[PDB]
Amino acid sequence: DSLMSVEVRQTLEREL
Amino acid sequence: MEEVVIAGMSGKLPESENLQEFWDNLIGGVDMVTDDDRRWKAGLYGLPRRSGKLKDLSRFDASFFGVHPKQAHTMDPQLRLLLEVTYEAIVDGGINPDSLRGTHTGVWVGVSGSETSEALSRDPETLVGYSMVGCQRAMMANRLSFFFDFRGPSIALDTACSSSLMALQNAYQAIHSGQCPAAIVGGINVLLKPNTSVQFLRLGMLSPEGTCKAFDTAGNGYCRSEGVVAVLLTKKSLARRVYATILNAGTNTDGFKEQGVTFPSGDIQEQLIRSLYQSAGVAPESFEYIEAHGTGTKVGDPQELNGITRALCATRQEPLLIGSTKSNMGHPEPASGLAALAKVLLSLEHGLWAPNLHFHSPNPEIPALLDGRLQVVDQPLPVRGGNVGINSFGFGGSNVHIILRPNTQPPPAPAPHATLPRLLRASGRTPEAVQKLLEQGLRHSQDLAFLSMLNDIAAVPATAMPFRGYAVLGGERGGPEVQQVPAGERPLWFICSGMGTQWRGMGLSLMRLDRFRDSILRSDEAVKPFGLKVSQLLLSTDESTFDDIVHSFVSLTAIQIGLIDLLSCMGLRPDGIVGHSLGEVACGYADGCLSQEEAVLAAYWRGQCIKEAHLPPGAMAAVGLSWEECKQRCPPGVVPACHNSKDTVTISGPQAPVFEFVEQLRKEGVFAKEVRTGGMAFHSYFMEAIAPPLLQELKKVIREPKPRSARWLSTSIPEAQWHSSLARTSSAEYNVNNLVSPVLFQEALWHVPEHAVVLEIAPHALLQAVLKRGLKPSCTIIPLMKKDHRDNLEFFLAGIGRLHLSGIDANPNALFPPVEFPAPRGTPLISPLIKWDHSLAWDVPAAEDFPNGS
Amino acid sequence: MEEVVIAGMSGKLPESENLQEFWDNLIGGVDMVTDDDRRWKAGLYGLPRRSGKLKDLSRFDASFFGVHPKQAHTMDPQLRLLLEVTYEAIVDGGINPDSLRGTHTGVWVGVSGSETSEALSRDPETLVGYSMVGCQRAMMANRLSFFFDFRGPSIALDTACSSSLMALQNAYQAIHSGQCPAAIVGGINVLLKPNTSVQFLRLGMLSPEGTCKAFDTAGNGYCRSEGVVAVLLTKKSLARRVYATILNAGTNTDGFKEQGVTFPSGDIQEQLIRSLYQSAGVAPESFEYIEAHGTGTKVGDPQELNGITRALCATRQEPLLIGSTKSNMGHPEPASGLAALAKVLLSLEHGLWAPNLHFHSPNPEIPALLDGRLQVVDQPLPVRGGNVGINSFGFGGSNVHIILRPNTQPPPAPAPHATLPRLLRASGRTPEAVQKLLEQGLRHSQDLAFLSMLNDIAAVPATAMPFRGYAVLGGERGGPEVQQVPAGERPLWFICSGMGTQWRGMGLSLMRLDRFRDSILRSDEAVKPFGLKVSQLLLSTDESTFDDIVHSFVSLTAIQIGLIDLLSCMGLRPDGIVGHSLGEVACGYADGCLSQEEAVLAAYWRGQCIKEAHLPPGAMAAVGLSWEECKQRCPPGVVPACHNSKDTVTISGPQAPVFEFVEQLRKEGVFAKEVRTGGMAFHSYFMEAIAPPLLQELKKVIREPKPRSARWLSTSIPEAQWHSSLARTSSAEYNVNNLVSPVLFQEALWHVPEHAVVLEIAPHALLQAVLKRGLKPSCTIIPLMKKDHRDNLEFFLAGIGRLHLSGIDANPNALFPPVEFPAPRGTPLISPLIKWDHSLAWDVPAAEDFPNGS
């Protein structure tokens, strides 16, 4: 979501 | 179909108690945002340490606005501040608030929060009912309408950040349609509980540094601020003062956006700007400044500035100046529009655009800032000319835009009446308020419009403001006089003296007044055919003129008639009239039972009949004896003449009875004042034959007489004959009886009430000492002219000034030519000059009265 | 300068989920106020036990309005309810909300409290940012403008008890000035925390019994209530439905009162009422009902009713009816105006005035109640005629008054087209919503305006409402059909068959439609000069007419042209066209490259040239063999004719080759279908000589031809010749090649996409079985006519109905004559027929989330 894009990139780096 | 103007302004902004302090901080470049624990701690809950807050929050003049002290403690502080600044705005307009007491003027207030309401209702066991009346959001407008007695619409509206300008837009539409004659627009914001700031922090809208870096690369949010602003709007014909004219005003909403509800859309804002100027009929080239919203956010500033450069900077060929007051002040959310409007109007009044703070490098996403089509005001630069646009956008999506045209009225051309001294009256709750108004009037003594509005706002009852004052400006003496006025009504009494008060140069100093000169020339054209003109008796006076008694008679009656005319245009209506011989002749014009021509011809015919026939030279020795002792100590054929007081009685007779009481004047304490007027025995038995020739001439002037009123107290008629047929009308037989009867100036004086204000209408107040011992000690005696005074106009104006200090309302603007209706710009502000009784402290909610998660 | 009407209505009131439930409870005389612990305890803090509260508060269709489920929990419940009733109001107006998506319509909401905002911000450690977006008071209007995409003003205003009617007054002024085309007025009140009720109790405004004894001797206060109401306002030209016309609307304020801020003043209210009707130009005799404020207080009721009887009952000579809905419902503070307006409009729609409750004896301080000049409605009495006044007064002193004139449109005169069957389509979030709409349409099958607005509101995309349905009303079969529509776009394809599908009575049943009859008469006047008229081929048909092939040709092409015209006025534009011989002739009119007259004359000239020359009788036996096996098993001189499918191929030749395959039809599984049309071998080598006489006649009709489009797929031209010069335009050589070439109806069918919707344009769908096995199984085939059907108009309307169930929008209102613009009164309500997906429960604040003094 808009404000949930920070958590989104967090999960992305956790997968990376 | 009506033009709408901004007439008044007042405000309370951070580190800005008055509107002038605001302007100074704005142009001073001071960071009005501070890092102090004035409302909560420094950085609790991770909040930013910096915020803009008001100087004081607990001061309120509760007795003036008629609120009970127990109700004042449980009131919203922002409503108390709004009541005070709402009074200050009306007074800044030059309008007395009592002239709007029954009218259809409306109130529109932009609020967004009520934290005092939820702090005062936390304990349901110790509640009071008054917290509903003083803290409900509708009461922020309804209490204003209740106190000021306004009959128009009374609305409180919330439209997020654009709430204050939306109220201005609705007030504009009410005046424009002809629904309302005037309006009041308000905006209020106060930071009390930190939970709202935590909400704004979690939304991502607050800068961590607490700074509005407007149009800057480093902008990351805004800083929360406080503020209480009010303006007065009116139609053009009611305006004494004009700051600007509202050309157009409108609003729209963003609608649906794919990005979210919060995100700004510059396309709808551009449409609003273009539709406004089109409908207004103004070209986009005519703009020179636009106050942007300018909150300093990362995505809002490029959207707003690109919308501005698409709507405005297409074919312009000139840089457009842009600024934002939130960089100086911070961002009050529902009061941001009126604060920006206050900055714009102060900049227009002082001729200089106030600079922005915290602007170092342009935002790279705004290409109009990099090629010069938009120019940020970062230095003080002068105002050149053109229109100013003000927009404020709420975060819900509400967009509002104003176009206003500044007034460019030049100062007036010099005139010969501008060198004459003027009067300035003042009123206030405290002596310091009156002192402030009088010293600011002294500082600007040559500004005629400023003094006219200051005289207009001073007509307040003594129960509301108990301290009044006055100062004569443009004279050589000067000196403010401040005293406390007793409450209640005091009757006004007119006393005009008789003969023996003439001198060389009667009323010349106040021949410069236009209405006095008009009255003198009216009396002149009246006596013109009778081989006489009193203008050379005024200007060309020497000692060969006033020793004649005809010239003395007309030059007394004309001066008294001119003084009565000046007092009548002043607004003053007497409650009791009592005269003394020729004074009682002028009492006919004072009462309205006579006119100009009959009074002047009656005085001249009295002089002409007296100078026609000849009788043995008479005397007016004055003795220190009472009325009863004088009848038993005079020789037969010698009659007492004037009953001035219990100790002063004037005797009348020939030279040898006059020489008789010279020896008795040596005996004991007896006055030997033997002042005569031409050696003629007025009020005596020697003129029993003077009346039948005189009566014949009079019947041809005061034919068909009018009845005397109950206010006129006769002095030639005894008390028991007051109901007779001779003393009901002011006929020709009434005037000839005045010459042949003694003047009873004592029994008339005991009918004067306790607290009367006595005005002496004479070219020289020689009866002032008689009236002091003859009247009750609770009376005030005011002279109007003084013999051999260098500037008798200053003496007259001081008498009007101390008439204001007694309690009688009297506006000295009517004496002089009126000022043109729009005041020129650069006229000094009035709303910083109003001071209140702030000796008490009232309750303000603390941060501990709000839930902290315990 | 524009007339303003009330177009839509919806609401949620105590014990009144829908507007009809409200009306029933109002006329039922039920006490909608209850004594239940639905929000707090029974009598805690000494509060009254009785209050009016909504039935449910935790239901919201979050997916429709596009809010995230985590954002929906932290939303104000009153905003969720306002979103739903705001949709229901627009739908009640008969207006699709998608027609207002870019317009300048405004939103005005009257709120007074935000308790959810302070309940959701009590813990500053577990806060979320979404509570600012869902609970701020400006968002109650801004979220409505965001979802519905409204560009007008979006204002939330608080004016105490008169807040809802003040919003209506401002929306009136926006439409009247021409600023806005439409508007939405809302009013919301929800009782969540008991501290506000304790404040009202300590002020002395709440009745201890919890009853509004309006106009009664025993009145001692009011009862607090809840409510969510919305209405839709519009200009007169946009209105499909009119409840009433707003004649005038205005407001004022009491100003200063000696008694206090709270006390009511009837003199200012009387002035407001008199100024309104004067400015409106209506006489006071023309009123028949006034909805008073009627709160039941001790000092408010005599002031209001004496003001009413001074402004209105001076010279009247008739009793004036008076009522108050607060006696039935209780008093919602900022939503009292729209609730009273809802009661008034429901009473006008049903013809009966709803009675008051709790009225036993008149107040002795109101003398107009004791002599009959004012009459309280305590029994249901019928509506006679005249105007209705609605006033609501806030306790701060704001006064608002409305004058509205009810519409008295009678039901229309009967017409012969009212006996024809109609179509009704519906959409909804659930199958139950579609069932509700279809059964309510079945209940009111004779109401034409009701069905027209129901058909208008049904054009919603399948992503928003995934369940659609239809029902044919006025027929004899009936039966609702409800199914779930797959999301996405589906292409629409037109297939029109060839010859062999005629029968006795072609299209008679749908000759009653006006546009079909107009197309038939246009084709008639086209063939009129050519010694022919197809009207007797329609009406006067027997078995001596259609055995001719000329009459069959024109009676096929005219019926197909009329069907295409009906589909074109329906709003439908085809994506792909593919025909079959004479069907491919009608494909020219389907594509737009032909017109009416050229198509009809081309068909008649084909028939005329065929009937002119004579060739050996031919055959059209059909065999169960593929296209390749038929070429190797025919005798020479015998050609395959029609490639319908992979298993059905029509052979062409004389009688003796036709007799040849009779014996092979016995062998294995071979079809022996030998259906012929006049014994002529179309699509064969016997008409190579038919074309040169025919071509000559054609060049005189389809001179200067137009090019064919890419949507038209040719069936007489092979695939590799599609780019040639013969197959780009629809010339005369294109039509004569159709007769002399075999029809390739298989390779055209493999170009049809996966999810196409196939429409068959034929007087009898004999190609339906061919298209089922010839196309992909993800395609829908819809016939339009059926041979020997008693009512073929019902069969056509069922095809349009299942075209709605596929996903293609098609409004059947265009088929019939339009309904007159104002709907007659007594038309059934639409807003109670809307049902949502309410399977989930959302968070509502409890009484424990508020400070109790602990």
Q: Which residues of B303-323 are buried (b: 16+ CB within 10 A; e: fewer)?
A: bbbbbbbbbbbeeeeeebbbb
Q: How far is CA B673 from CA B546, B624, B649, B667, C201, in A?
A: 21, 10, 11, 14, 82
**Catalytic residue (choose from C10, C114, C161, C336):** C161
CB contact under 8 A, C199 and B127: yes
CATH number of B616-686: 3.30.70.250
Do the Cβ atoms of C734 and C714 come closer than 8 Å? no
Of B421, B500, B493, the residue nearest B764 (C-alpha): B500
CA closest to C177 among chain B residues:
B177
**Catalytic residue (choose from C73, C331, C683, C804):** C331
CATH topology of domain C4-37+47-410+843-847: Peroxisomal Thiolase; Chain A, domain 1 (3.40.47)
How far out from the chain centre does Cα B807 lie?
15
Neighbouring residues of C367: CB distance < 8 A, sequence distance ≥ 6? none
Specify burial of residue B676 (Cβ count, 10 A radius: 0-12, 13-18, 19+). Answer: middle
Q: How far is CA C564 from CA B640, C496, C550, C600, in A?
A: 129, 10, 21, 14
Q: How far is A7 from chain B (nearest CA, A)?
A: 15
- Is B161 marked active-site? yes
As given in the structure block, the two tokens for residue C385 are 């005629």
Distance CA B791, CA B789 (A): 6
Distance CA B610, CA C794 (A): 126
Phi, psi of C604 (to 5 degrees): -70, -35
Sign of CA dihedral B734, B735, B737, B742: positive
Q: To which residue do tokens 């002091």 refer? A: B772
Q: B489-613+707-788 and B616-686: same fold?
A: no
CB contact under 8 A, B256 and C146: yes
Q: How far is CA B791 from CA B76, B481, B567, in A?
A: 54, 19, 19
Question: Residue C388: beta bridge partners?
Answer: C289, C404
Distance CA B58, CA B65 (A): 16
- Is C401 marked active-site? no
Neighbouring residues of B725: CB distance < 8 A, sequence distance ≥ 6? none
Q: What is the 3-state secondary structure (H, E, C) of C590-629?
A: HHCCCCHHHHHHHHHHHHHHHHHCCCCCCECCEECCCHHH
DSSP assignments along B367-379, one per residue: GGGTTTSEEE--S
B41, B151, B248: which to substitute to probe chain C, counting the most C Cβ within 10 Å? B151
Rg (CA), chain C: 36
Distance CA A14, CA C526 (A): 77
Of C455, C456, C454, C483, the residue nearest C467 (C-alpha): C483
Residue A3 contacts B where some CB pair is shorter than 8 Å: yes
Q: How far is B145 from chain C (nearest CA, A)?
A: 6
Of B339, B315, B313, B312, the residue nearest B328 (C-alpha): B339
Q: Which CATH architecture has domain B413-487+796-819?
A: 2-Layer Sandwich (3.30)
Residue B522 marked as a ligand binder = no
Instruction: Give the three-state DSSP class for C251.
Output: strand
Q: How far is B157 from chain C (nearest CA, A)?
A: 4
Instruction: Give the three-state DSSP class for C218.
Output: coil
CA closest to B203 among chain A residues:
A3
Residue B86 marked as a ligand binder = no
As given in the structure block, the two tokens for residue C114 are 């935000």
Query: What is the resolution in angstroms?
Result: 2.0
Task: Identify the DSSP state of C501.
Answer: -
Query: How many CB atoms sit inside 10 A of residue C44's CB?
Result: 15
CB nearest C121 (choices: B104, B199, B256):
B199
Phi, psi of C66 (to 5 degrees): 65, 40
Give the side-chain half-sphere CA count within 13 A for C157: 32
Of C685, C690, C682, the residue nearest C608 (C-alpha): C690
Q: How far is B257 from chain A (nearest CA, A)?
A: 13
CA closest to B260 among chain A residues:
A2
CA closest to B202 among chain A residues:
A3
Distance CA C471, CA C417 (A): 19
Q: How far is B201 from chain A (nearest CA, A)?
A: 13
Do the Cβ atoms of C243 and C9 come closer than 8 Å? yes
Residues 363-402 of C with CB under 8 A from B: 394, 396-398
CB contact under 8 A, A2 and B204: no
Distance CA C649, CA C628 (A): 10
Distance CA C10, CA C839 (A): 22
**Cα–Cα–Cα angle for B734, B735, B741, rounded to 5 degrees:** 85
Q: Where are the domains positioned within chain C?
A: 4-37+47-410+843-847, 616-686
Distance CA B348, CA C38 (A): 59
Tell me how many residue pairs between chain A and chain B have CB atoms under 8 A apart.
3
List CB contacts (< 8 A) between B257 and chain C.
Answer: 146
Q: Residue length, chain A?
A: 16
Give the side-chain half-sphere CA count within 13 A for B607: 25
As given in the structure block, the two tokens for residue C131 are 């509570």
List CB contacts (< 8 A) between C148 and chain B.
Answer: 256
Question: Residue B389: beta bridge partners?
Answer: B290, B403
Residue B573 marked as a ligand binder = no
How far out from the chain centre does Cα B644 lie?
41
Distance CA C162, CA B260 (A): 33
Distance CA C504, CA C653 (A): 28
Do the Cβ atoms of B563 and B517 come closer than 8 Å? no
Query: How many CB atoms sit inside 10 A of residue B216's CB?
Result: 20
Overall CATH class of domain B489-613+707-788: alpha beta
The span from the first CA to the last CA of chain B, in angstroms, equals 59
DSSP assignments along B149-197, one per residue: T--S-EEEEEBTBTHHHHHHHHHHHHHHTTS-SEEEEEEEE----HHHH
Distance CA C776, CA C480 (A): 28
DSSP assignments along C386-407, one per residue: SEEEEEEE-TTSEEEEEEEEE-
Residue B56 marked as a ligand binder = no
Give the side-chain half-sphere CA count within 13 A for B536: 7
Of B351, B206, B229, B369, the residue nearest B292 (C-alpha): B369
CB contact under 8 A, C195 and B152: no
Chains that touch C (3 or more CB pairs under 8 A): B
CB contact under 8 A, B253 and C151: yes
Query: How many CB atoms sit inside 10 A of residue C380's CB?
Result: 14
Superfamily of domain B4-410+843-847: Thiolase/Chalcone synthase (3.40.47.10)
DSSP assignments along B557-579, one per residue: HHHHHHHHHHHHHTT---SEEEE
Residue B131 contacts C where some CB pair is shorter than 8 Å: yes
Helix (H) or strand (E) holding B669: none
